[PDB]
Amino acid sequence: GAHMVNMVSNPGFEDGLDSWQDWQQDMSAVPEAAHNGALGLKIGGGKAAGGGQDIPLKPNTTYILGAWAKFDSKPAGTFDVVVQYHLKDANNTYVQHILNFNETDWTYKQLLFTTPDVFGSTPQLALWKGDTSKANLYVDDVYLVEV
């Protein structure tokens, strides 16, 4: 109203891996992983792996983080979607806003948070598949919207 601002670049992986860092060389944008559109992100099983992007959030602002994910077989651990940054306080507090997934059917989760007055480091959006079973992880439509 009149627009909703989304802060995630290439949120649906429709531009492949554009804008996303592939930390463990274990990511591909493939039709297999799509929940919407032509592509989704597949993070390959067998080792902990993930990727992410840096996001310039505004201070004192309400954001909604949301994502769709599923594992293609039962995981031991989880796949986590995280917004993280440091505060500029005495303890340099590291803040993490976390969605945890372990489902084998496509599942949507979301959370709301409000950013501080000042950031101690540039916010990062992390897609972290910490599970080490053979399960592949699909994730799609990762949104971070200002309201």
Ligand X SMILES: OC[C@H]1O[C@@H](O[C@H]2[C@H](O)[C@@H](O)[C@H](O[C@H]3[C@H](O)[C@@H](O)[C@H](O[C@H]4[C@H](O)[C@@H](O)[C@H](O[C@H]5[C@H](O)[C@@H](O)[C@H](O)O[C@@H]5CO)O[C@@H]4CO)O[C@@H]3CO)O[C@@H]2CO)[C@H](O)[C@@H](O)[C@@H]1O
* Contacting residues toward Ca ion, per CB under 5 A: 12-13, 34, 36-37, 40, 140
128 contacts ligand X (rule: CB under 6 A): yes
126 contacts ligand X (rule: CB under 6 A): yes
Residue 2: asked if its preceding bond is cis (omega within 30°), the reply is: yes
Stretch binding ligand X (CB under 6 A), from 68-76, 77-85, 114-122, 134-142:
77-85
Give the count of residues interacting with ligand X (CB under 6 A). 13
Q: Where are the beta strands (DSSP E) in 23-130?
A: 27-30, 40-43, 49-54, 62-71, 79-86, 94-101, 107-114, 124-129
84 contacts ligand X (rule: CB under 6 A): yes
Per the structure block, which two tokens stand in for 134? 């053979």
- CA dist 126 and 100 (Å) reads 12
Greatest Cα pair distance, the chain, in angstroms, is: 46
Name the residue nearer to ligand X (CB basis): 34 or 115.
Answer: 115
Smallest gap from residue 106 Cβ to ligand X (A): 20
Contact 67, 79 (CB under 8 A): no
120 contacts ligand X (rule: CB under 6 A): no
Q: Is 14 annotated as a binding residue?
A: yes
Smallest gap from residue 15 Cβ to ligand X (A): 21
Query: CA dist 122 to 2, 5, 6, 9, Å?
Result: 28, 19, 17, 15
100 contacts ligand X (rule: CB under 6 A): yes
Residues in contact with ligand X by CB under 6 A are: 23-24, 50, 80, 82, 84, 96, 98, 100, 124, 126, 128, 130
